[PDB]
Chains A and B, each alone.
With several copies, the nearest count.
Chain A
Amino acid sequence: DIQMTQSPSTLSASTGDTVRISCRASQSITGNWVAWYQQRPGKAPRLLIYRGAALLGGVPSRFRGSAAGTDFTLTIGNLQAEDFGTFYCQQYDTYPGTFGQGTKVEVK
């Protein structure tokens, strides 16, 4: 029963920068149960954020998730060039898990 949105819809930056995406759900999930993804188009997604701000062993330390109620954030400080591509948001609380509508990150 969720149709998520995220802010922004399409964004560009360059290397060495700092960047912000947030995703908002129709409900307000409490247990931070979100997950964010990236892909270059043609490749597969790569889980980089599970449960708000827990990173994997292998995802770079520059990424940071954060939590505020319904709006959950990911920040990239010191952006590297092999990080561009589409991001996706995810709630995974009420079955089925409906996802985000993607955010392309490119260079102007």
Chain B
Amino acid sequence: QIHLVQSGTEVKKPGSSVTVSCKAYGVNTFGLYAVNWVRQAPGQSLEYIGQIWRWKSSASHHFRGRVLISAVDLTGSSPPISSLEIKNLTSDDTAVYFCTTTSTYDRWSGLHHDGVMAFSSWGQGTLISV
């Protein structure tokens, strides 16, 4: 079935840049599936960041013009892999990050609605400290 992994736990310097992978062992593509990037502050509840959805890269207004997400789907050696990249990691960006794929083929399933969607299968969460 679907499974998700990503990069490990990375601790970096203030004012650095970070990239977090997303390897989707089970996604037939990211054309029809869509992935979602979600932070989680330590103890504090999870906060959405961004998504890829039929190759329209988007992030929130809390993250526009600073954070960038990419995705390359199914190749030979690689499963479909997305990646979250952040420049200028503040102390606020000290968080646990998450990649999650959603199935967006049968349009009346209700896991998705016109860009926003319920997040089907999670990964492992990555600590990033500043």
Interface residues of A (CB under 8 A from B): 31, 33, 35, 37, 43-47, 50-51, 54, 88, 90, 92-102
Contact = CB atoms under 8 A, between A and B. Distances in A.
State the majority secondary structure of interface residues on B: loop
Contact of B98 (A35, A44, A101): A44
Nearest to B61: A96
13 contacts: A37-B119, A44-B123, A47-B118, A47-B120, A47-B121, A50-B111, A51-B110, A90-B118, A92-B117, A96-B61, A96-B116, A99-B47, A100-B45
Contacts of A54: 110
Interface of B: 45-48, 60-61, 98, 110-111, 113, 115-125
Contact of A95 (B111, B115, B119): B115
Chain A at the B interface: mostly helix, strand, loop or mixed?
Answer: loop
